[PDB]
Amino acid sequence: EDNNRIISRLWRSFRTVKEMAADRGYFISQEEMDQSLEEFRSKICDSMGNPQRKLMSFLANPTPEALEKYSDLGTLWVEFCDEPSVGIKTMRNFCLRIQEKNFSTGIFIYQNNITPSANKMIPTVSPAIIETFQESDLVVNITHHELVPKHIRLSDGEKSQLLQRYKLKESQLPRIQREDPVARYLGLKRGQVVKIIRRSETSGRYASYRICL
Amino acid sequence: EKRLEQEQRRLEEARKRQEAELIKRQELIKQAEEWNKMDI
Amino acid sequence: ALEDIMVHYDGTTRNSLGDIIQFLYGEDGLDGTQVERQTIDTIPGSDKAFHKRYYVDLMDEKNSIKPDVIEYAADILGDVELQKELNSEYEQLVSDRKFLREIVFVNGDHNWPLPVNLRRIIQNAQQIFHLDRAKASDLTIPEIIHGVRDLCKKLFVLRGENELIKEAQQNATSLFQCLVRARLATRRILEEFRLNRDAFEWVLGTIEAQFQRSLVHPGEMVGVI
Amino acid sequence: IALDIEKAKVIQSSIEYTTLKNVTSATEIYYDPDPTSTVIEEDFDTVEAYFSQSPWLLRLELDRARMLDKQLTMNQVADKISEVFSDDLFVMWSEDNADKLIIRCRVIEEDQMLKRIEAHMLDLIALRGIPGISKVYMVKHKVSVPDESGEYKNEELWALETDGINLAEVMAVPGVDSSRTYSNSFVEILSVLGIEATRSSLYKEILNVIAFDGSYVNYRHMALLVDVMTSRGYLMAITRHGINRADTGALMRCSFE
Amino acid sequence: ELAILKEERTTTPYLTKYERARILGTRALQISMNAPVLVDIEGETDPLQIAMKELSQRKIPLVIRRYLPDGSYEDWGCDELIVD
């Protein structure tokens, strides 16, 4: 019934969130990655079948490779919201939780909608970063699409090397929007550069670069 | 046979790294579960 | 919209503000009048046909180079360093086949515009050096391997010693190097084309010169074109 | 699902949008002041079999043929009405075996109110399907795939082509290959997949338009065009609204428009 | 500052077609305005043909200054650029 498809969509969203966390540098165990649907229903759903979003929250730490490559990578806290509509109360509570439990970045997945007050409170949570995603747009992982090539964020040294090699200013590079779906998937901040290796029918392979806004 | 031996050595090293990372991950899993129990 | 776009002396395509539109013109840095449709010989066919065409085994006597095409046919069986060279060539060809079949062209299309017509160069060499008749060739296998390998690192699209420059240079010539390796294979050179030493050196020099002549010229107004 | 026709038809039925107005054939308003009985003689047997507020009655006759063609159940429509209307409307439905398929309703001066309720019901009751996808067709695609011997051999597979676009919802439907769904509108591609996919889709559309009549244009020209059209992070139209909103010189911009 | 040292010149070592056309035109104009010729002319009279003869023998006394997009430049002599 509709409960089964709700559970399936929630499981797909959870898998996409785990894949996103793994792609940004954090470590997620392979058993957790291939955690099947039946195990999800066993671990989350109760006797009547309703799911508890509060049981899906987890923590992550960067791999040594990612920590060496990116030095601004802290601890990640992902939390799903039971409340369909997220008010200023819930956003403030989440901000308080992040501030007290010293996390570098916190991802907050909501179900239906977020109030404008909460959005206006998002930028004032510095130095911690809060990012908001909707449940519906996380069902399918867009980075697995055939039309989406692989994006790789560059380190500060690599960005400096690129700018020196091409003798460019930052404003002279191709741009990518902050609200771009792939930019939001990678958690791009303003001033960061991604390397995009792409298929080419004239040379086989072609590496392009874009700078976030 | 030398190439096979080198491949086995690399697989064993990767397995050891994966085991260490799993050991590190289990502590985070336990802490997250405890904090979610506290939230309830 | 496209009037102020020009190729610059560093190879990039830029507008009047200096903003980069393309890091290399046409992703290959070539002129549009210098390419022709050519077939890449590693893409089509079956695995049996590919193995029969490209694999050279110096141990099994009925799957080796023919004895009437090479003057050194006697002291060739049993070598291990030469067999290692041939295995390295075959592994490179298999990597090229995997790359083209899985990433670049997934539907099997293999007739694409590329520079330096290799068939024309090969038949010109055959006509010039009179490569007819059953005469054995004096072109050793390591000479073939090292000549092709060195040729695949002198196709300069970008000049410089920076690591990013080398990565871009290797990226820009991937498809053309696949074409060259698919054509100038050891078994193919020894049996189908029957080149000798002078013909081989002439082919290598001609490929390098013609590739240098096929690059786009800085100052081109490619936007208006 | 791609090599089976029945599963493909199941997916097609689950994707296509179907409203109440599609299966409905006629709607009528009747006066009946008895909640437990009725005046109409044709339906009296069925309603008394069922039984064993306002006097205004609302019954609508639905076409049997198109209702069976869409593969829908009367109970499903009843649950949809019940969900959208809670307990504000009492609903009854004739069974499958009825000569004419009917479903009544009763409210719990209100003739105009019932008329507005009937119009609203006909307008926006969604039975199943993705909103925006007006029609769905089945198409066969000839695709060349390598064999187990390495040889390339043709093949035939089933695929759906729709009228109307909703990429995000259709991509999440089970049974759909979510990593290959394509739209001919690249604004939606930009909103869902990003700017690199937008570049690829823009090249694909331009190549289709150019190559339909048999013409051929070299790749680098269209590549340069779509790279200019996607270099700023968003879609830049070849118009005054796109070209003249740049940082170029005033003398260069004034000479266009 | 803007000049680039001769050892680290990264532009192409070949004479492009635009540079060839401009160099031939400038040299022909100079020859037609009574500039000394650096090659032995047998019976040639046309300034453009004399300029082409000078180019083929690498005797044109001109320097090409190639500009980079950032503002820097490289100086190349006509005698050290390969001409087809």
From TrEMBL, chain A:
Domain RNA polymerase subunit H/Rpb5 C-terminal: 140-212
InterPro entries on file: Arch_Rpo5/euc_Rpb5, RNA_pol_Rpb5_N, RNA_pol_Rpb5_N_sf, RNA_pol_subH/Rpb5_C, RNA_pol_subH/Rpb5_CS, RPB5-like_sf
Transmembrane as UniProt keyword: no
Residue intervals passing through the bilayer: none
A GO biological-process term: transcription initiation at RNA polymerase I promoter
Domain of life according to the entry: Eukaryota
Location of this chain's protein in the cell: Nucleus
Family from the record: Belongs to the archaeal Rpo5/eukaryotic RPB5 RNA polymerase subunit family.
PANTHER family: DNA-DIRECTED RNA POLYMERASES I, II, AND III SUBUNIT RPABC1
Protein name: DNA-directed RNA polymerases I, II, and III subunit RPABC1
Organism: Komagataella phaffii (strain GS115 / ATCC 20864) (Yeast)
From TrEMBL, chain B:
Coiled coil: 1-31
Domain of life: Eukaryota
Entry protein name: Component of the Paf1p complex
Originating species: Komagataella phaffii (strain GS115 / ATCC 20864) (Yeast)
Source taxonomy: Eukaryota, Fungi, Dikarya, Ascomycota, Saccharomycotina
Full-protein residues shown: 891 to 930 of 1044
Automatic annotation (TrEMBL), chain D:
Chain coiled-coil ranges: none
Protein's cellular compartments: Nucleus
Domain of life (superkingdom): Eukaryota
Cited function: DNA-dependent RNA polymerase catalyzes the transcription of DNA into RNA using the four ribonucleoside triphosphates as substrates.
Family under the similarity heading: Belongs to the RNA polymerase beta' chain family.
Name listed for the protein in its UniProt record: DNA-directed RNA polymerase subunit
Organism for this UniProt entry: Komagataella phaffii (strain GS115 / ATCC 20864) (Yeast)
Residue window of the full protein shown: 1126 to 1406 of 1743
Automatic annotation (TrEMBL), chain E:
GO terms under cellular component: RNA polymerase I complex; RNA polymerase II, core complex; RNA polymerase III complex
Localisation: Nucleus
Highest taxon of source: Eukaryota
Any GO BP annotation: tRNA transcription by RNA polymerase III
UniProtKB keywords: DNA-directed RNA polymerase, Nucleus, Phosphoprotein, Transcription
GO molecular function, one term: DNA binding
Keyword Ubl conjugation: no
Keyword DNA repair: no
UniProt record similarity statement: Belongs to the archaeal Rpo6/eukaryotic RPB6 RNA polymerase subunit family.
Protein name: DNA-directed RNA polymerases I, II, and III subunit RPABC2
Stretch of the intact protein here: 71 to 154 of 155
